Amino acid sequence: PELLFILVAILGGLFGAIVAFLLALRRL
Amino acid sequence: PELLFILVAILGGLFGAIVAFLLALRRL
Amino acid sequence: PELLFILVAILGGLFGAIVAFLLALRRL
Numbered sequence A, B, C: 001p002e003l004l005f006i007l008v009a010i011l012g013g014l015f016g017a018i019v020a021f022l023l024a025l026r027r028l
C-alpha cells in the first residue's frame, strides 16, 4: 500500500499545480 | 490523518508550481 | 510515524508539480 499512497500524493501535487495555474489565469 | 496527507500533497504541488513560476521568471 | 507520512506527501506533491510543469512545457 506504500506505492499506491505515493501516487495519491503525486496525483495531489499534479492537481495542486494545475490549481495554481488556473488561479493565475483567473487573474489574467 | 488521511485528510492531512492529501492536503499537504495538494499544497506541495500548489507551492511547487509557484516556485517553478518564479524560477521561470528568473530566466527572462 | 505520522511525521514522515506528511514529509513524503510534500515530496510526492512537489514531484507532481514538477511533473506537470515539465508536462505542460512539452506542449509548447
Ligand SMILES: CCCCCCCC/C=C/CCCCCCCC(=O)OC[C@@H](O)CO
Pocket (backbone or CB within 6 Å): A020, A021, A024, B017, B018, B020, B021, B024, C021, C024, C025
Ligand atoms: C505561499 C504563497 C502564497 C502566494 C504568493 C503569491 C506571490 C508570489 C508569486 C505570485 C505569482 C505566482 C504565479 C504562479 C502560476 C502557476 C505556475 C504556472 O503557471 O506555471 C506554468 C507557466 O510557467 C506556463 O508554462
